[PDB]
From a paper:
To understand the molecular architecture and mechanism of DOCK−ELMO GEFs, we have used cryo-electron microscopy to determine structures of DOCK2−ELMO1 alone and as a ternary complex with nucleotide-free RAC1, and combined this with a crystal structure of ELMO2RBD in complex with RHOG. The binary DOCK2−ELMO1 complex adopts a closed, auto-inhibited conformation, whereas in the DOCK2−ELMO1−RAC1 ternary complex, DOCK2−ELMO1 adopts an open, active conformation through a conformational change of the ELMO1 subunit.
To answer these questions, we determined a crystal structure of activated RHOG complexed with the RBD domain of ELMO2 (ELMO2RBD). The crystals diffracted to 2.4 Å resolution with a single molecule in the asymmetric unit. The RHOG structure consists of six β-strands and six α-helices and is similar in structure to other RHO family small GTPases. Characteristically, RHOG nucleotide binding is coordinated by two key regions: switch 1 and switch 2 loops which bind the terminal γ-phosphate of GTP and a divalent magnesium ion. ELMO2RBD demonstrates a classical ubiquitin-like fold consisting of four β-strands and two α-helices, but interacts with RHOG at a non-canonical binding interface. In contrast, the interface between RHOG and ELMO2RBD comprises both switch 1 and switch 2 regions of the GTPase. Major interactions include a hydrogen bond between ELMO2 Lys9 and the main chain at RHOG Phe37, as well as a salt bridge between Arg66 of RHOG and Glu13 of the RBD. Indeed, ITC analysis of an ELMO2 Lys9 to Ala mutant shows the importance of this Lys side chain, as binding to RHOG is completely abrogated. A key RHOG side chain at the binding interface is Arg66 in the switch 2 region, and ITC analysis revealed a RHOG R66A mutant is unable to bind ELMO2RBD (right).
Author numbering:
A (entry chain B): 6 to 54, 59 to 81
B (entry chain A): 1 to 177
The structure:
Amino acid sequence: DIVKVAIEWPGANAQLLEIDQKRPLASIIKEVCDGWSLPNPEYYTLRYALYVTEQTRNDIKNGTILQLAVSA
Amino acid sequence: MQSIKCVVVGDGAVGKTCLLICYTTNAFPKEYIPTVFDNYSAQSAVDGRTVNLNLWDTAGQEEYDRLRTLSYPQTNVFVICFSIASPPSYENVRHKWHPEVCHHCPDVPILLVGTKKDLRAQPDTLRRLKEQGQAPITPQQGQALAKQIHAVRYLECSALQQDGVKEVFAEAVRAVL
Ligand SMILES: Nc1nc2c(ncn2[C@@H]2O[C@H](COP(=O)(O)OP(=O)(O)NP(=O)(O)O)[C@@H](O)[C@H]2O)c(=O)[nH]1
Ligand SMILES: [Mg+2]
């Protein structure tokens, strides 16, 4: 299963991605972080523009806009 | 060989997707499936030159309005569409679409496209629009809209009849080439 989303990062142009729901968020976040040349991806989390966790990952609907945010 | 980012926008159901499917495969899809966002890539030769035409399909439903605007940055040319059988989509161009595009991308050429040209003289379309006191959009009306928004060109086409779709994107690349 796949889901289309946009991920925003302040100052940069958003990335329009099709997320593979079989890949861990951690691999997706590392790829998304590379897209904006960001190290230390583990300290980032996707939240709605609420957090996207592995537990709720499948609640995401096509066309939803996510933010790449610095974790707590 | 240069690459051209071409973004197709317009009201929901005006035919932006069928437009891109016809140009890409000459098919015509069975049902209306709203677009979230989709990409097509094609090699096309215009005036003896070849370019990478990267076509970005866009959502016309208001639900995905802000999502649509995230695709805009660095667009080389916009194709703004309205249905010849939907005057409402005709009005939204000059009041909603042209303002929005100009704001996010000033000085980016705009090509104006009247889709579904085959419905201009169909009885069902004529009757329906007649009840509301309107008729299919006229070629003269399209030109007046193109002038008003400074479109580089005004074109009419029909994916269902495979009429003029090729020329639409040949002109998209020309506007920037
Ligand atoms: N008669 C006729 N119908 C057409 C033509 N092109 C598209 N349609 C119909 O118009 C309806 C909308 O088509 P579609 O390409 O999906 O429109 P869209 O602008 O991409 N919609 P969205 O903004 O939701 O993605 C569909 O039923 C399609 O069959 C055409 O040339 N002639
Ligand atoms: Mg569409």
